[PDB]
């Protein structure tokens, strides 16, 4: 952001995930859920958070599929969007 | 890198395009508990010593 002298002082410009991890998370036979939030902080910083989420096969679950309903997914996405606006 | 000696503990199979190379489990007689799989020309029996001009390659198994 600025240089004092023999010192490049840095400021936040974006969190990211290593695609090693990002790809690792995305496996078949479960619902991938995403939510973006165009948000502003207290000071004049405008962020675009991207959440991600994966439905969990339960401990006693025998069924392979492990999917969600469309209204369940968009209730989750509405929650994600609410929580990320709340914490920014 | 030094020139080391390894003993044939087991001759696994016969690899090579014309089956011309014995594929061999070699035990390093310097570091007596380090073992690798390694391709060898000519007739090899169990318990003859190979002269390795490097000890860092490892052959791909049958």
């Amino acid at each position: 952001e600025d240089v004092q002298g023999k010192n490049c002082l840095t400021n936040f410009h974006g969190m990211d995930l290593t695609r090693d991890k990002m790809c690792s998370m995305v496996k078949k036979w479960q619902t991938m859920i995403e939510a973006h939030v165009d948000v502003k902080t207290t000071d004049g910083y405008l962020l675009r958070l991207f959440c991600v989420g994966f439905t969990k096969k339960r401990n006693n679950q025998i069924r392979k599929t492990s999917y969600a309903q469309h209204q369940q997914v968009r209730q989750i996405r509405k929650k994600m969007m609410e929580i990320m606006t709340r914490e920014v | 890198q030094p020139i080391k000696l390894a003993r044939v503990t087991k001759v696994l199979g016969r690899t090579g395009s014309q089956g011309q190379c014995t594929q061999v489990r070699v035990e390093f007689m310097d570091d007596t508990s380090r073992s690798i799989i390694r391709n060898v020309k000519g007739p090899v029996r169990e318990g003859d010593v190979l002269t390795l001009l490097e000890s860092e390659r490892e052959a791909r198994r049958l």
Binding site: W29, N60, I62, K64 | -
Partner: protein, 132 residues
């Protein structure tokens, strides 16, 4: 390639099966047995048969062979197969019993036994293998 042909093995099996008691483990004695109890026109075939005979005799010393029969068949499948213990594994003091196996005994005449320990039921109804 020292694989014995059907003519060697069939002959060698029948020679053991019919003249078991005349044979032993030595090659050279049962070579001369095979000379007497069979009319073999070759010397080489005589040796082949005598050789496989001796191999099957060593196999019979270990245990019973799939393609031959011994006279009693044979003190283990006949005599030892008449094994009887002191008391049967059936004759149990405390027989554990399911609550629903207790119910079908109650809808039988046998609603009250002395030696049936009715157990607590299997909670967490989870008994299958997951799919895929």
């Amino acid at each position: 390639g020292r694989v014995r042909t059907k003519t060697v093995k069939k002959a060698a099996r029948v020679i053991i099966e019919k003249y078991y008691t005349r044979l032993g483990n030595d090659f050279h004695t049962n070579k001369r047995v095979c000379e007497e109890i069979a009319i073999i026109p070759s010397k080489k075939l005589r040796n082949k048969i005598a050789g496989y005979v001796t191999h099957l005799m060593k196999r019979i010393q270990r245990g019973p062979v799939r393609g031959i029969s011994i006279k009693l068949q044979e003190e283990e499948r006949e005599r030892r197969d008449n094994y009887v213990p002191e008391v049967s594994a059936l004759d149990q003091e405390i027989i554990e019993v399911d609550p629903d196996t207790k119910e079908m005994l109650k809808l039988l005449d046998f609603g009250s036994l002395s030696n049936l320990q009715v157990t607590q039921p299997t909670v967490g109804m989870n008994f299958k293998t997951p799919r895929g």
